[PDB]
Design an enzyme around this catalytic site. Sequence first.
Site, PDB file in Angstrom:
ATOM      1  N   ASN A 137       0.800  -1.226   0.000  1.00  0.00           N
ATOM      2  CA  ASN A 137       0.000   0.000   0.000  1.00  0.00           C
ATOM      3  C   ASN A 137       0.833   1.276   0.000  1.00  0.00           C
ATOM      4  O   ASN A 137       0.401   2.315   0.497  1.00  0.00           O
ATOM      5  CB  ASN A 137      -0.985   0.005   1.162  1.00  0.00           C
ATOM      6  CG  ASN A 137      -1.802  -1.264   1.228  1.00  0.00           C
ATOM      7  OD1 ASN A 137      -1.835  -1.934   2.257  1.00  0.00           O
ATOM      8  ND2 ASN A 137      -2.450  -1.613   0.122  1.00  0.00           N
TER       9      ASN A 137
ATOM     10  N   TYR B 224       3.033   3.548  -2.791  1.00  0.00           N
ATOM     11  CA  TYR B 224       3.509   3.825  -4.144  1.00  0.00           C
ATOM     12  C   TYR B 224       5.030   3.740  -4.197  1.00  0.00           C
ATOM     13  O   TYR B 224       5.703   3.960  -3.194  1.00  0.00           O
ATOM     14  CB  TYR B 224       3.081   5.226  -4.589  1.00  0.00           C
ATOM     15  CG  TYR B 224       1.636   5.352  -5.026  1.00  0.00           C
ATOM     16  CD1 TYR B 224       1.196   4.773  -6.210  1.00  0.00           C
ATOM     17  CD2 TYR B 224       0.721   6.070  -4.268  1.00  0.00           C
ATOM     18  CE1 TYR B 224      -0.121   4.890  -6.620  1.00  0.00           C
ATOM     19  CE2 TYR B 224      -0.598   6.197  -4.672  1.00  0.00           C
ATOM     20  CZ  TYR B 224      -1.013   5.605  -5.848  1.00  0.00           C
ATOM     21  OH  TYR B 224      -2.321   5.728  -6.256  1.00  0.00           O
TER      22      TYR B 224
ATOM     23  N   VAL C  57       2.023   7.030   1.001  1.00  0.00           N
ATOM     24  CA  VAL C  57       1.282   6.034   1.763  1.00  0.00           C
ATOM     25  C   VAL C  57      -0.182   6.033   1.355  1.00  0.00           C
ATOM     26  O   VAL C  57      -0.826   7.080   1.333  1.00  0.00           O
ATOM     27  CB  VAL C  57       1.374   6.303   3.275  1.00  0.00           C
ATOM     28  CG1 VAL C  57       0.534   5.296   4.048  1.00  0.00           C
ATOM     29  CG2 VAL C  57       2.818   6.255   3.728  1.00  0.00           C
ATOM     30  N   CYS C  58      -0.705   4.856   1.031  1.00  0.00           N
ATOM     31  CA  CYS C  58      -2.116   4.732   0.679  1.00  0.00           C
ATOM     32  C   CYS C  58      -2.920   4.232   1.868  1.00  0.00           C
ATOM     33  O   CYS C  58      -2.937   3.037   2.171  1.00  0.00           O
ATOM     34  CB  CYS C  58      -2.309   3.812  -0.528  1.00  0.00           C
ATOM     35  SG  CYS C  58      -1.763   4.529  -2.092  1.00  0.00           S
ATOM     36  N   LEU C  59      -3.576   5.166   2.544  1.00  0.00           N
ATOM     37  CA  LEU C  59      -4.373   4.840   3.710  1.00  0.00           C
ATOM     38  C   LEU C  59      -5.724   5.513   3.577  1.00  0.00           C
ATOM     39  O   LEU C  59      -5.809   6.700   3.265  1.00  0.00           O
ATOM     40  CB  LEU C  59      -3.670   5.315   4.979  1.00  0.00           C
ATOM     41  CG  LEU C  59      -3.987   4.558   6.266  1.00  0.00           C
ATOM     42  CD1 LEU C  59      -3.794   3.065   6.066  1.00  0.00           C
ATOM     43  CD2 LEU C  59      -3.110   5.065   7.402  1.00  0.00           C
TER      44      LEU C  59
END
Length: 155
Positions: free
Chosen positions: A82, A84, A89-91
Amino acid sequence: GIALSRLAQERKAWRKDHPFGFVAVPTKPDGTMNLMNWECAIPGKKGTPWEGGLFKLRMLFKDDYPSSPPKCKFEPPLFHPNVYPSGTVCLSILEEDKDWRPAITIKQILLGIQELLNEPNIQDPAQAEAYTIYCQNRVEYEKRVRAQAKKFAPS
């Protein structure tokens, strides 16, 4: 002015309430604080392939804040489904049109990310490598996580 006022309280709160090992301090023209650019550090959770590692990220707030969330990048980028390749951060909690809330503290952000480290969200991957190895070869996956935990072990 809005973001700065709210960010000043955030630093205040943080100073008197934050987990051991965590770090969240603004950056620095010198001597003057840049409340819009925070240098942070997240310890790996105990009893995980992440333990022992101190993973540092940058927390970038906009003037849109707190209506909008900060943008969080791991520097260097991390091997994780999660995150890139850029380190972003992909949250869910870091997305305006989703789980983000003005109330969310820097603490909650840094903890939310810490849980994400050891518990990836297969639903929406950002990194192709990490996702693949995670879905097929868990043993090798965790082998790459421990190797990374050591690379980012303090000292």
